């Protein structure tokens, strides 16, 4: 009828994870840095791990669940996948740590560094990550530059599949219900008519782009959620950041057509963004481009600016530790 996921759930002994410390909190909980080193293994793998706050709201085990059941079924190069569950108190989402964390910041922090052909890479890992997540037949809802995350600035992955939706074998159209949403990242349709499907997922990525080309900058910056659907039925769009050429604005726009069938798909996108990624400095033009450089793994200080020394001898990245 589908076919059947065969993935696997780990769940892992609270006793294997070590060294916990906080990378952040707010509403959808804490996430915390830890080496999980699986027992007689002779690995330490390098982790982040989510938590909400309480053991009770049997809504908020719920959601998380569903998360795991997503992060469980994924596994691509441009997608983080889960490690697996701590069944604690409190249920707790373990998956590779993502050193640099989420690509919003990221661009933020070290705009002066980022270069042509860092951006146009990010765009067609993205694309890759998005495209998997649609031959799997999912639906993200949130992809933002905030849901991208950085294992090397040369290598981002998409998370956050907390509004990841599957399709039916033979079904199109995901049709939601309430709940919080990212009003300035979604199509017209998905706002008006809660309709999601993977070409309003290319709407997303275009918003995202348009995040990454801005360095961050925050989309229809002051204007109130409540009117984003008058600005676009109106035809108003984000505007051609400085740094790009038509060539890049335009691929960016056209994830913003009303008709949905209209917009990329995600392996044109991978196409595009591939072809200008030979020759950045032709469709993004920064000022002392050609000078600038990002941490890369063949760096000294690169193992040691994550690590303790201590542990270093045996730490292996999840990317590398596979199981049967
Ligand atoms: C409250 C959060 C918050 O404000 N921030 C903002 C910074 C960010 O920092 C990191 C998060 C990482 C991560 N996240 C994650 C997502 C889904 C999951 F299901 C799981 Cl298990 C994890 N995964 C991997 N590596 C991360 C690395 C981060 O910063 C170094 C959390």
């Given at each position: 009828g589908e076919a059947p996921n065969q993935a696997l759930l780990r769940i892992l002994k609270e006793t294997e994870f070590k060294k916990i410390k906080v990378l952040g909190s707010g509403a959808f909980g804490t996430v915390y840095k830890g080496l999980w080193i699986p027992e007689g293994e002779k690995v330490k793998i390098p982790v982040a791990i989510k938590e909400l706050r309480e053991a009770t709201s049997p809504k908020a085990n719920k959601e998380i669940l569903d998360e795991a059941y997503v992060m469980a079924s994924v596994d691509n190069p441009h997608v983080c996948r889960l490690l697996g569950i701590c069944l604690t108190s409190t249920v707790q989402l373990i998956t590779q740590l993502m050193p640099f964390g989420c690509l919003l910041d990221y661009v933020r922090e070290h705009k002066d560094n980022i270069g042509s052909q860092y951006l146009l890479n990010w765009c067609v890992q993205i694309a890759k990550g998005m495209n998997y997540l649609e031959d799997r037949r999912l639906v993200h809802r949130d992809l933002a530059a905030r849901n991208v995350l950085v294992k090397t600035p040369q290598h981002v992955k998409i998370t956050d599949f907390g509004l990841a939706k599957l399709l039916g074998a033979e079904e199109k159209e995901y049709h939601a219900e309430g709940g919080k949403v990212p009003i300035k990242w979604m199509a017209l349709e998905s706002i008006l008519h809660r309709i999601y499907t993977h070409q309003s997922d290319v709407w997303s990525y275009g918003v995202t782009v348009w995040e990454l080309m801005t360095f961050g900058s925050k989309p229809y910056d002051g204007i109130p959620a409540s009117e984003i659907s008058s600005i676009l039925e109106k035809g108003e769009r984000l505007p051609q950041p400085p740094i790009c050429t038509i060539d890049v604005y335009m691929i960016m726009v056209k994830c913003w057509m009303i008709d949905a069938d209209s917009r990329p798909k995600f392996r044109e996108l991978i196409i595009e963004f591939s072809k200008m990624a030979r020759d950045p400095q032709r469709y993004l033009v920064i000022q002392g481009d050609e000078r600038m450089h990002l941490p890369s793994?063949?760096?000294?200080?690169?193992?040691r600016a994550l690590m303790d020394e201590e542990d270093m001898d045996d730490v292996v990245d999840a990317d590398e530790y596979l199981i049967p």
């Open positions: 793994p063949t760096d000294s200080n690169f193992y």
